[PDB]
């Protein structure tokens, strides 16, 4: 959680990772409702997210622009991107320390508010069209790397922007968001061959 030249604190990085992994674990344990009021299906092989300084560096470069939008495609090759902003009429400095976790709650909130019952867990065109792509990237079983950048100087210090980058990039159409199964109990349950038993998520390093 130490990233040379970074503008985040170690704690911010940890809070972001711990929150997103908690979400993932709650999800694969069947504890989270979709828009229809029905629990999402239990999952297996959901990777445990690791912080990547490389990802933070690209996300931070974009956050520094103070633009509420995506970075250009050619700077996002192989990489997912989620964008969050908070617009105040006063200073946002007090919001910096929870920027990442507020952003994760906002992206993640797509599940209960916009994500209709999808039993196959397949990311079809009709599922994608709902605007659940921020949530689906945070939930993407194959993604295992996350890095985020934050700007609080935007609009005279009155706008907060948080940018998170994910690798590998999630949201490939016609692939499942995550595999249907049981959370890992032992290493051999995981295709990566290492299981985080407390969370039921599979470990994948870097
Ligand atoms: C997610 O859901 C989509 C929509 O059903 C799956 O794609 C569909 O796969 C079917 C076969 O599993 C395709 O059927 C074929 O249709 C052609 C058209 O003539 C026939 O010639 C052929 O013999 C089959 O009957 C179906 O067309 C296809 N849907 C579309 C519009 O693409 C998808 O399955 C996955 O993607 C497809 C493209 C293949 O790679 C499948 O093997 C693969 O499982 C579902 N995704 C997942 C991960 O389940
Ligand atoms: C989730 O809620 C929506 C809106 O209330 C319903 O349309 C879904 O049931 C639907 O059943 C038919 C009409 C068809 O639209 C189907 O695609 C939907 O599933 C409901 N989902 C379920 C599975 O009950």
Residue numbers in the entry: 17 to 222
In the authors' words:
Recombinant BmVAL-1 was produced as a glycosylated protein using a plant expression system. All 206 amino acid residues have ordered main and side chain electron density maps, of which 36 (17.5%) fold as beta strands, 59 (28.6%) fold as alpha helices, 11 (5.3%) fold as 3–10 helices, while 100 (48.5%) form loops. The overall topology of BmVAL-1 is an alpha-beta-alpha sandwich, in which a mixed strand beta sheet is sandwiched between two helical/loop regions. There are five disulfide bridges in the BmVAL-1 structure (19–69, 82–170, 164–180, 200–211 and 206–218). The last two disulfides stabilize a unique carboxyl terminus extension that is made mostly of loops. The two predicted N-linked glycosylation sites of BmVAL-1 (N52 and N138) are glycosylated and the branches have highly ordered 2Fo-Fc electron density contoured at 1.5 sigma. Some N-glycans with one terminal GlcNAc residue (MGnXF3 or GnMXF3) were also detected. The glycosylation site at N138 is within the caveolin-binding motif (CBM) loop that is required for sterol export. The overall structure of BmVAL-1 is a prototypical CRISP-type SCP/TAPS protein that has two histidine residues which coordinate divalent cations located in the large central cavity. The central cavity of BmVAL-1 has a volume of 2567 Å3 which is larger than other single CAP-domain SCP/TAPS protein structures including Na-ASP-2 (1824 Å3), Pry1CAP (1591 Å3), GLIPR-1 (2000 Å3), GAPR-1 (1303 Å3), ves v5 (2048 Å3) and tablysin-15 (2263 Å3) as assessed by PDBsum.
